[PDB]
């Protein structure tokens, strides 16, 4: 199989559904983590290491920041290589 089509194709699908299908659902479940509350309430260096010091703002209308791009892109790459690797096993000698 052509890696460029399969890997890019799978990544596009996983980015497309993530942006257009599961974005609303994913955000709602992320607020279920708000009900419990913040991890720590302190002002020491080690307490600062547990806070969202940097907020990743995005200009995308739906709020599809880079962290979401990395998450959904990784699933597409993972699925893409699973498809390629399995299809490679066809026509393998002594393997």
């Amino acid at each position: 199989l052509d890696p460029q089509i399969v890997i890019s194709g799978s990544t596009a699908a996983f980015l497309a559904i993530g942006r257009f299908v599961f974005l609303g659902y994913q955000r709602r479940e992320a607020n279920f983590d708000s009900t419990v509350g913040p991890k720590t309430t302190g002002a020491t260096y080690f307490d600062d290491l547990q806070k969202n010091s940097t907020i990743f703002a995005t200009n995308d209308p739906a709020g599809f920041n880079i962290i979401d791009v990395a998450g959904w892109g990784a699933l597409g790459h993972a699925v893409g290589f699973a498809v390629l690797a399995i299809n490679s096993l066809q026509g393998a000698n002594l393997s």
Partner: protein, 194 residues
Amino acid sequence: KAGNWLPGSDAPAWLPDDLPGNYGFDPLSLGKEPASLKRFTESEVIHGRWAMLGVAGSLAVELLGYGNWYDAPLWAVNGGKATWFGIEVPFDLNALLAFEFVAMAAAEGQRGDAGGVVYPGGAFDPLGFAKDSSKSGELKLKEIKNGRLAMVAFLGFVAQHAATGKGPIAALGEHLANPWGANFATNGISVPFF
């Protein structure tokens, strides 16, 4: 109440009377919690609707002479090409999974966010059969009764094939040939001691 599954019994309290297809059948009291029953009510309709499509599809394939429901995906294994009504299809297995996963995710994800809708209507009822909303009681009862019947039938397809290995239409023909000598009591599988 649509009837009584066990004549002379008392209907469970937690099963509301107007619920479509309510025969009072809940031996294990799985629907006792109102929140759980609400989910179960939706799942039964969705399971039944898929079963109705599946049983109709499984019978249709063999009636028209295109094989049985079990052999349909063998082309993707042996190396042949897909066919629909005898018309060759240009896709392969890995391609098919792509369209289905994306397509079904969009539809099911859109349904999921509706928060438990089971009778949408509107665009899903173009002819307006249930637009009345008052006479829909019978149609909802007819849908669930055919849905439950289809779910039982499909389990028969899977169970029968695992025992005899023949398609649903072929099995029916074999029963009619020798009703007393060809049935579940003659598999050699269903009843070990027969």
